[PDB]
Write a protein of this length. Structure first.
Ligand SMILES: [Ca+2]
Ligand SMILES: [Ca+2]
Ligand SMILES: [Cl-]
Ligand SMILES: [Cl-]
Ligand SMILES: [Cl-]
Ligand SMILES: [Cl-]
Ligand SMILES: [Cl-]
Ligand SMILES: [Cl-]
Ligand SMILES: [Cl-]
Ligand SMILES: [Cl-]
Ligand SMILES: [Cl-]
Length: 123
């Protein structure tokens, strides 16, 4: 929110960070079962993105990066490749959040985890 991914979410969606860090079955810590909607699928993919970074030896949950937003889009930067990779995962997710604003549903914010059912899609 005052931190990097949160700041990117706010810039790209017009929403508060708090409206995406606990949404559906995947936005927020961990994730299981079937994503509730397209925005949730952005978070399923983002989780997979961090998994890939972790396997490369990065710590994406802790990496801090630099970025700007202009009209060509989101520009990523950071001293290290792991910082830039984390930015790239976040950028993809924030763009996915913006793309799917049309089906964002307030009822899925702070979704009770017990409501998550079905299989867990593979990465
Ligand atoms: Ca998650
Ligand atoms: Ca939720
Ligand atoms: Cl991704
Ligand atoms: Cl990879
Ligand atoms: Cl900026
Ligand atoms: Cl962009
Ligand atoms: Cl843009
Ligand atoms: Cl640094
Ligand atoms: Cl690195
Ligand atoms: Cl709504
Ligand atoms: Cl809203």
């Amino acid at each position: 929110n005052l931190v990097q991914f949160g700041v990117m979410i706010e810039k790209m969606t017009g929403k508060s960070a708090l409206q995406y860090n606990d949404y559906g079955c995947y936005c927020g810590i961990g994730g299981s079962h079937w994503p509730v909607d397209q925005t949730d699928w952005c978070c399923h993919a983002h989780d997979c993105c961090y998994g890939r970074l972790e396997k490369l030896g990065c710590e994406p949950k802790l990496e801090k990066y630099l970025f700007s937003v202009s009209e060509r889009g989101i520009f990523c930067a950071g001293r290290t490749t792991c910082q830039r990779l984390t930015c790239e995962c976040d950028k993809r997710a924030a763009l996915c959040f913006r793309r799917n604003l049309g089906t964002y549903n307030r009822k899925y914010a702070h979704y009770p985890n017990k409501l998550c059912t079905g299989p867990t899609p593979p990465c």
